[PDB]
Write a protein that binds this DNA or RNA. Structure first.
Ligand SMILES: [Zn+2]
Lengths: 726, 162
DNA sequence: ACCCGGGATAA
DNA sequence: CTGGATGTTTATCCCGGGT
RNA sequence: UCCACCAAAGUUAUCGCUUUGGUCAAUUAAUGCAGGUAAGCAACAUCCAG
């Protein structure tokens, strides 16, 4: 039978026993650093070997075994039998030791004692190898083509030829043909020649380009030939023999001032990341057990730390054939429970057939994907006096994500932002030895503080990031009690009040005590305060009751409570996923209710490319989600669909001038032409009112959906696309 | 007009009883919700709800039987119910009215007025008045503070209807 | 003498 | 913030140390 | 370097338009939906690219 894997998300606090929480937190704090050092150390070794001897075997070292040795080199342990080591293992360890001493001083890192780290190394390094393969497979050919274009000087030749023909006043017809004959076609021939490892015709490239090409080819073996006479296909099929060439390609790109790209994957994020927790890892690192854990006791050991009676852990899927195999991932806050059913032993609407298109009558919904508006849905039965229109805006989905980002950028301590700015000045993606070493030193200079700030959720916090700061409570219109940013609770009985602002200011201090009592009783607030601070806060609260007029007590309380101001970044990350899932289900509910349960969706062919000044949009993942929910979805061409008036097929134009919709660009530009509004030029389109003359006004999305309906009706009647929209 | 009686205990010592009379005919939903909470036949009620906000010479407040800090409370109709009308006004001392956090935010909390409150008209729904035990109301009021925090801990031990 | 951590390799 | 590629473990053997 | 949603008027199917009536969980919470409690379902991590 086939195999599939499903994952269920949850939280540590909900399934993890309190007694075993602290061991897990330390384990993540250790694994995260080791993995990060493994990435940096591995790159450091390669740049040391490649920058000193071009005869290095970098191509042969891309294997899980080498990464495991690198990961273990950072762990101090009692060495076992030495004669049982394989020759490959000895060579890898010797190579690692060749630079181990230098790297530690460069990175200012000390070995960490972590017994039973074999499994952790295997999983983390397996991911490392996967990242290395995927990174090159995705961008090897893409970057090679860019380098070839730069070597051919396509931009320079096009500019020179275009300007030369401008002096001769040649038309676009001649210019676009001369450029094609003299630039594009020769470039294609050069690419074809390079694709087979053979040099291009002499004279097409300058001496420097030819020398660089020879240097690039020297990376490969002289007698080696690309499979199927295609370098691009060979790399995908056999990437094992192109890593060194990929590095040389990156070096050439940097030499030509091209934007640096990360050839060697690196973990730059300081927030802890998810790590696998195998049964053995749980047995040794978490449970602190000191003996072998057999498979039969695997479930018993797991049940000692987590509750297996929860629905999340129990069987799932059709026929309850999916079982939890004692494997999961966690980053200290979130948990991913994996389930598998196997043992651990190792169509466009135009091209639809008659049997389908003719049976969709009365159930087609037209969707126009916009930029600011994610979707503009209109039902085919809509009329002017019957508006079956639905708008799904970008604000609805990005409400939570934008809110978290705003909170993070406001609560960032001055020291943290300065450290981030200083660290960001170094180009990590660069392959230069000097620059990479400088980045390592810069990162290591503030690695401790950054980890402490971002690890405030679980790691002990000893440094206070908000000194000389006074905090006070406040209440909004909805009677929500906010402590600077902390949400305490909603005071449902806050409106009843006497005349505002009594002359006795000291009464405000007494109100602070009431707010403190409303705050210290909150579950999420009490759990974040240690016993000693809570006792001191209570003592200060008692003093405030006896001596409200003294502001020193409030200042001390604010200083003690400054810990709570640290944001739980991991929880925000988990909440972002929940909000996205809720919005996706929210969208499904709206589609089913607003239009119908068995509605058929028609979507445009626009791919929504990512562009500057335009944040991402849902174009590709949306189709997968809609098809997963079971909504019949079909694609329709958008060619000139919004360029004509639905009422009379006349051309449309933009006429209103509006202040720059993007507020940050208002300073740069007062007004810009309207985006989503159009009017019909033809004067006969509208039953115009008297004395002024007028024309029908349309929305860009509204016109598009109306034209989509016209195409749908024409296809249903004759199955031929209208000539106007073809 | 249904009558409501409360037993008030301060610092563990009973201090008296207060009797309220509700304008059920004028404010049906609020009176019904108040009656249900006082009876306690639904497994919950004012039993144990303290007076968390008492301002001397101004007002008494209470009815938080879930948190006892002015943030909790619910209603038989759910989390909140819409308002009904303002046929009654805070024109006399001792009037019993609902404490809320805005339109349609009424819950279980209530407040008792000790002086005329013309400014509160059109904001809070008045649905009752004190008919007996006004001396106990003054006694409870004397224990309040300008900030609303009571000098002593006052809790309604029992509630009922008559 | 006789057994316990801890590492290492392997399918 | 969105899109794309690849995973998602458990036995068996040997020794310095301890007793 | 900014922005929750429903609907009415300007209005003609009228804009990152103006005025209105209404909606609410705010959150640094919770694994989510779902059915009125039990039932049934729900792919996660790493890296890279913009
Ligand atoms: Zn027209």
């Amino acid at each position: 039978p086939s195999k599939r894997v499903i994952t269920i998300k949850t939280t540590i606090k909900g399934i993890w026993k309190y007694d075993y929480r602290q061991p897990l937190y330390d384990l993540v704090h250790t694994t995260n650093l080791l993995v990060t050092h493994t990435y940096a150390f591995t790159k450091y070794i390669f740049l040391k070997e490649l920058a000193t001897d071009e005869n290095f075997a970098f191509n042969e070292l891309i294997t899980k075994d080498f990464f495991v040795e690198v990961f273990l080199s950072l762990v101090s342990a009692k060495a076992g039998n030495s004669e049982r080591l394989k020759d490959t293992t000895k060579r890898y360890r010797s190579l690692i030791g060749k630079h181990k001493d230098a790297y530690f001083e460069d990175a200012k890192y000390t070995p960490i004692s972590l017994a039973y780290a074999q499994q952790i190394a295997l999983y983390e390094c397996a991911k490392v190898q996967t990242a290395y393969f995927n990174n090159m497979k995705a961008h090897f050919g893409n970057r090679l083509r860019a380098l070839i274009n730069k070597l051919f000087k396509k931009k320079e030749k096009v500019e020179s030829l275009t300007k030369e023909m401008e002096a001769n006043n040649f038309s676009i017809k001649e210019i676009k043909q001369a450029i094609r004959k003299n630039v594009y076609q020769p470039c294609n021939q050069v690419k074809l020649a390079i694709t087979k490892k053979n040099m291009p015709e002499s004279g097409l490239l300058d001496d420097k380009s030819v020398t660089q090409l020879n240097e690039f080819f020297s990376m490969y073996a002289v007698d080696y030939t690309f499979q199927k006479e295609s370098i691009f296909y060979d790399v995908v099929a056999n990437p094992e023999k192109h890593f060194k060439a990929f590095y040389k390609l990156a070096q050439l790109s940097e030499a030509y001032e091209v934007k640096p790209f990360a050839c060697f994957p690196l973990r730059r994020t300081f927030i802890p990341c998810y790590m696998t927790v195998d049964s053995k890892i749980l047995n040794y690192h978490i449970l602190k057990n000191k003996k072998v854990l057999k498979m039969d006791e695997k479930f018993n050991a797991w049940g000692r730390v987590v509750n297996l009676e929860r629905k999340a852990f129990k069987s799932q899927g059709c026929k309850k054939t999916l079982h939890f195999q004692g494997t999961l991932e966690t980053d200290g806050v979130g948990v991913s429970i994996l389930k598998q059913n196997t043992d651990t032993n190792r169509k466009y609407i135009e091209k639809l057939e008659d049997a389908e298109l003719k049976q969709t009558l009365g159930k087609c919904v037209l969707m126009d994907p916009g930029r600011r508006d994610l979707l503009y849905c209109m039902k085919e039965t809509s009329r002017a006096d019957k508006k079956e229109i639905m708008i799904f805006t970008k604000n609805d989905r990005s409400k939570c994500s934008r809110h978290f980002r705003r909170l993070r950028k406001l609560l960032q301590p001055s020291q943290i932002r300065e450290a981030e700015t200083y660290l960001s000045g170094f180009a990590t993606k660069s392959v230069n030895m000097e620059k990479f070493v400088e980045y390592i030193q810069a990162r290591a200079s503030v690695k401790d503080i950054l980890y402490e700030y971002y690890g405030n959720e679980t790691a002990k916090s000893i440094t206070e990031f908000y000194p000389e700061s006074q905090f006070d409570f406040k209440v909004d219109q909805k009677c929500n009690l906010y402590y600077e940013n902390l949400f305490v609770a909603k005071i449902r009985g806050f409106y009843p009040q006497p005349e505002h602002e009594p002359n006795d200011i000291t009464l405000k201090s007494h109100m602070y005590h009431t707010y403190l009592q409303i705050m210290l009783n909150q579950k999420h607030i009490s759990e974040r305060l240690n016993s000693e601070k809570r006792r001191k806060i209570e003592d200060l609260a008692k003093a405030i009751l006896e001596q409200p007029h003294e502001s020193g007590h409030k200042t001390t309380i604010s200083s003690l409570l400054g810990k709570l101001r640290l944001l739980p970044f991991r929880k925000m990350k988990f909440s972002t996923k929940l909000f996205s899932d809720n919005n996706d289900r929210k969208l499904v509910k709206n589609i089913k209710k607003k239009f119908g349960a068995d509605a058929v969706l028609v979507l445009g062919n626009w791919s929504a490319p990512n562009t500057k000044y335009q944040d991402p949009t849902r174009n590709k993942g949306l189709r997968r989600m809609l098809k997963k929910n079971g909504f019949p979805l079909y694609l329709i061409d958008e060619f000139r669909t919004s360029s004509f008036c639905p009422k009379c097929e006349s051309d449309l134009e933009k006429f209103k001038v509006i202040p720059n919709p993007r507020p940050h660009n208002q300073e740069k530009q007062p007004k810009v032409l309207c985006h989503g509004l159009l009017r019909c030029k033809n004067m006969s389109c509208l039953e115009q009112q008297t004395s002024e003359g007028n024309q029908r006004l349309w929305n860009r999305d509204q016109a598009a959906v109306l034209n989509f309906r016209k195409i749908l009706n024409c296809l249903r009647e004759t199955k031929q696309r209208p000539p106007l929209f073809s | 007009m249904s009558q409501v009686y409360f037993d008030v205990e301060a610092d563990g010592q009973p201090i008296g009883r207060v009797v309220f009379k509700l304008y059920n005919d004028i404010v049906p939903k609020t009176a019904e919700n108040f009656r249900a909470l006082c009876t306690g036949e639904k497994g919950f009620g004012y039993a144990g709800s303290p007076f968390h906000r008492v301002i001397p010479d101004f007002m008494l407040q209470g009815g938080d039987f879930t948190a006892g800090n002015g943030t909790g409370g619910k209603s038989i109709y759910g989390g909140k119910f819409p308002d009904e009308n303002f046929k009654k006004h805070h024109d006399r001392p001792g009037l019993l009215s609902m404490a809320n956090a805005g339109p349609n935010t009424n819950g279980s909390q209530f407040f008792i007025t000790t002086v005329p409150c013309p400014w509160l008209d059109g904001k809070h729904v008045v649905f009752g008045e004190v008919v007996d035990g006004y001396d106990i109301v003054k006694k409870v009021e004397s224990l309040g503070s300008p900030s609303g925090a009571t000098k002593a801990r006052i809790v309604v031990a029992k509630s009922g209807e008559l």
